[PDB]
Structure 1
Amino acid sequence: TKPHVNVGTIGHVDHGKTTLTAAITTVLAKTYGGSHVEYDTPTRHYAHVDCPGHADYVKNMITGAAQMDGAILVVAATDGPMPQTREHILLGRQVGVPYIIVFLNKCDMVDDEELLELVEMEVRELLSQYDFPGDDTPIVRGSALKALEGDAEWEAKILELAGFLDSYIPEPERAIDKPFLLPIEDVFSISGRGTVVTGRVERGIIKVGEEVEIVGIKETQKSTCTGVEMFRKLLDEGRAGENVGVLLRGIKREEIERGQVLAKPGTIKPHTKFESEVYILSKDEGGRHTPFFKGYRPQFYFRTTDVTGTIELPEGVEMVMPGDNIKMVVTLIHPIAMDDGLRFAIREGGRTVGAGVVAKVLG
């Protein structure tokens, strides 16, 4: 299957994001044949969204919209960066977009080479101010509208941008290529065979003979896989995406529980305290009807289980209303296997009232 890359455009309302995206689709179709937009290069398939609003983007990211692998910052060369260009880039930094490419639009309306260079240097300096690698950032001098009007010269610049999408955004790592992880759903005992834990392999592959760690909730344990099965039939291995039962050596039924994960040794750790970005459902989205305050003590649902936590609101924030998005520091009552980027639900009484992403593990 052709690699999938999630990109997005960000920039001033007037600087041509829509025109560019249309031009990318048009030129890639003419060249290579065949809400969000999609387009393909010979080597990659792209899903492309717009980022018109800061809060809107953060909410979308939290509620499930796949994070951008890369962003295209669109700046018209006629103006150069706007004051709010730093807020566009600051959004990128805040959600941690791994790469930014710049498309300098409307270069057909700028005659002076020295002026294009001033604009370019400003953009590089802004990028570096927010710790993007401004010196090494690809900047394409193009014209969305003229490319869309089929001017050969400017079509080539659309193809150039596409080349950088291809070369500068590394191929996103596939689940199967990541270190093994299975979230445990159920635990059964089998006499004359031993303990079996079930779940859907989230990443990687588990084979008979391989060591695993059992991580979260309780002190980590290690075991060896002595079998893998699917609907009571033995498999040589279990792969990412597959619902399996993993048979374990020696370890006993009472020593393992739902909410723990099976993992390749050394690749995931349990934590209790983390920084997060959260979104609280509105009433119409089936959420809370009323605000909560500093003493709110919900459950945090990680993969297969709830863990109670307390919260620390940001400085100056005393109230959270339905529909809000905010940052919060969460301290769980016991550890759970986690990495930066892990999504969770916020629940009360077993009902989902919000969503979050782990931004930064602390302890």
Structure 2
Amino acid sequence: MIIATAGHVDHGKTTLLQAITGVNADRLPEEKKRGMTIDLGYAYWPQPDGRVPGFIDVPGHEKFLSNMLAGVGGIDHALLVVACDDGVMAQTREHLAILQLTGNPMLTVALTKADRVDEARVDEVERQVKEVLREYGFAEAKLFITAATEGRGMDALREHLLQLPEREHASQHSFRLAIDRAFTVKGAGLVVTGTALSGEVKVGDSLWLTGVNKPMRVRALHAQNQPTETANAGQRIALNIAGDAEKEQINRGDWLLADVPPEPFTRVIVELQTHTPLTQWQPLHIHHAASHVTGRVSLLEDNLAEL
């Protein structure tokens, strides 16, 4: 039950994650030095039940957005934290628009700073969120008002957490993995961690690393802080792989997949959904899961476009 946390910066998203999981999202000294979530951090909630829900905390900053885009690949569920103090923030509305465009099956709104505000502000912000959901075309959403420092809404949140589907995947799909963080551990090589879009993998499997264009044997893997001999799509996957590839050629947003791709294409057609119409042949940022690109859009019939 992977739930990625998103929302405007410093509205308690880390406090919520320490409340549920107690994981320390910080890894780099700088984010420790600066106290903000400058870049993505992960939490996991292991249970006797044997499922481990995945938690991805992300910066709400636009310059840092390229990393959040690295984290939005493969989400099963999205939780947008909203502090009750100011209500929904503009960054939050931006993230909501980005989820509506990405076609995320469901999302939860979690209201924070509830203890500091009077209950009247609680109901008011609750109304405002329920109105905004209709604005974005959102269907079901379960609003939870909680002071995460107090643990107020935890029990109400639990039922929802168990409700969240894990995506099933058909056995017949070409294996596809989105690389995220490549960091060697002193033991056993590279171990690169990334979300698996489709397929299963095992240590004996050979993979094909894109952008380095090399086959790579899997040394080992951890499903979600859960070492195992095999890994299925729909979770973040630490993946330890061998092969001639080295970190200098490795890049975030490189694909690991079963068979050599035909070489990348610049031109592409895309269906458009937009809050307002785009204009022909104009420069813009293309943002894909773990991929930054710059390109010019062109208009074809109506909500059809050429990148």
Give the TM-score band, short-chain normalised: 0.5 to 0.7
Matches within 5 A, 1:166-205: 166-167=162-163, 169-173=164-168, 175=169, 178-181=170-173, 203=199
- Aligned partner of 2:155: which letter? L
2:160 to 157, 161, 164: 164
Aligned with 1:108: secondary structure? coil
Aligned twin of 1:107: 114
Q: 2:136 matched to which residue of 1? A: 130
Q: Indicate if the aligned counterparts of 1:59 and 1:325 stay in contact, CA closer than 8 A.
A: no
Q: Is the 8 A contact 1:55 1:325 kept in 2?
A: no
Q: Which sections of structure 1, spanning at least 5 residues, go unmatched?
A: 28-34, 148-153, 184-201, 204-239, 245-283, 289-300, 330-359
Pairing of 1:242-257 with structure 2 (within 5 A): none
Partner letter of residue 144 of structure 2? V
- Which letter does structure 2 place at the counterpart of 1:85? T
How far 1:309 sits from its partner (Å)?
A: 3.8
More strand by percentage: 1
Counterpart CA distance in 1 for 2:95 and 2:284 is 27
The alpha-carbon distance between structure 1 residues 179 and 67, as it changes in their structure 2 partners (threshold 3 A), is closer
CA displacement 1:154-204 (0-9 Å, x = unmatched): 2xx21321321211x21221x4xx152458xxxxxxxxxxxxxxxxxx65x
Q: State the partner residue of 2:293.
A: 325
| RMSD between aligned residues | 4.1
Q: How many residues align?
A: 199
Among 81, 86, 102, the alignment partner of 2:93 is: 86
Listed as ranges, the matches of 1:1-363 within 5 Å are: 5-26=1-22, 35-43=41-49, 44-52=51-59, 53-54=61-62, 56-57=64-65, 61=69, 66-112=73-119, 114-133=120-139, 136-147=140-151, 154=152, 157-167=153-163, 169-173=164-168, 175=169, 178-181=170-173, 203=199, 241=201, 286=249, 303-307=259-263, 309=265, 311=267, 315-317=281-283, 324-326=292-294
Report the TM-score, using the length of structure 1 for normalisation: 0.45
- CA shift for structure 1 position 124: 1.8
Three-state SS of the structure 2 residue aligned to 1:166 is helix
Letter in 2 for 1:14: D
Higher CA-based Rg: 1
In 2: Cα distance, 1:55 partner to 1:306 partner: 32
C-alpha spacing 1:91/1:41, structure 2 compared with 1 (3 Å): farther
Could you give the per-residue CA deviations for residues 104-141 of structure 1, whole angstroms, max 9, x where no partner exists? 112112223x43222112112222222221xx311111
Q: Which amino acid aligns with 1:124?
A: K
Q: 1:13: Cα distance to partner?
A: 1.5
Aligned mates of 1:308, 1:16 — CA distance in 2: 41
Identity within the alignment, %? 29
Q: Secondary structure in 2 aligned to 1:171?
A: coil
Question: Does the 8 Å CA contact 1:6/1:66 hold for their aligned counterparts?
Answer: no
Instruction: Please list every run of 5 or more consecutive structure 2 residues that lacks an aligned counterpart in the other structure.
Output: 24-40, 176-197, 206-246, 252-256, 270-279, 298-303
User: RCO higher in 1 or 2 (8 Å CA, sep ≥ 6)?
Assistant: 2
8 Å CA contact 1:10, 1:71 repeated in 2: yes
The secondary structure found in structure 2 opposite 1:103 is strand
Distance 1:326 1:50, change over 3 A: farther
- What is the alpha-carbon distance in structure 2 between the residues aligned to residue 88 and residue 65 of structure 1? 11
Deviation for aligned residue 1:69: 1.0
Q: CA deviation at 1:74?
A: 0.8
Q: How many angstroms apart in 2 are the aligned matches of 1:90 and 1:319?
A: 16
